[PDB]
């Protein structure tokens, strides 16, 4: 619930960086996770509904964030990726 908030912050911050936008993260409304962890890869997909301000006005957005580590050819490093971000 704390680490969900960091991924939601990342989704807003990643959306703003990518679209030259100034949405302002307020909070996580709800979050779902699905996971596939094998001997080859760690993969969690997060579906976040968040509240953010667009020019001061609070609105609801859904973001899809993927977190992956390749256990074969990868580093210690995880990799966060924004897949989708819409109102």
């Amino acid at each position: 619930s704390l680490e969900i908030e960091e991924l939601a912050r990342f989704a807003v911050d990643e959306h703003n960086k990518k679209e030259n936008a100034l949405l302002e993260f307020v909070r996580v409304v709800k979050a779902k996770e699905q996971e596939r962890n094998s001997i080859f890869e760690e993969f969690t997909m997060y579906y976040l509904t968040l509240e953010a301000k667009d020019g001061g006005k609070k609105k609801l957005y859904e973001a899809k964030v993927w977190v992956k580590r390749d256990l074969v050819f990868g580093g210690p490093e995880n990799f966060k990726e924004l897949q989708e971000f819409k109102p």
Partner: protein, 143 residues
């Protein structure tokens, strides 16, 4: 009487049981899990695996040291079950490449190199990580 016929009976029964999720023996279960893992690895990592296989083409001249040096790359960050599967797949690719070049004699040498590398570099990690039985429970498709 015929030891060959006995071996074919055991092989065929092991196969039929495995198709229904049963195992002739714990060794048969380890072999089946490693076969399945190698298949999954080659489907998922086709592109990255091609970057590994391209680094070594074995000839009668090639020393164990050249094999060891490339496989050592795989395990630079440590040993895990996925990298062990990759190691097996790498050896499999080297054997197919050898037979494709009409050099099947190299298959026995690669099998020897792989057994040497396992016992030297990987067996300590396998034993302290619960051995191949741990690999099966984790990864095996079993009834």
């Amino acid at each position: 009487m015929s030891q060959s016929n006995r071996e074919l009976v055991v092989d065929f029964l092991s196969y039929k049981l495995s198709q229904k999720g049963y195992s002739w023996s714990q060794m048969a279960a380890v072999k089946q899990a490693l076969r399945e893992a190698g298949d999954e690895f080659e489907l998922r990592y086709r592109r990255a695996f091609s970057d590994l296989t391209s680094q070594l083409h074995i000839t009668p001249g090639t020393a164990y040291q050249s094999f060891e040096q490339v496989v050592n790359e795989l395990f630079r960050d440590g040993v895990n079950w996925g990298r062990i599967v990759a190691f097996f797949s790498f050896g499999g690719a080297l054997c197919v490449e050898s037979v494709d070049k009409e050099m099947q004699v190299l298959v026995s040498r690669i099998a020897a190199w792989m057994a040497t590398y396992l016992n030297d570099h990987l067996e300590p990690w396998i034993q302290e990580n619960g051995g191949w039985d741990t690999f099966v429970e984790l990864y095996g498709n079993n009834a």
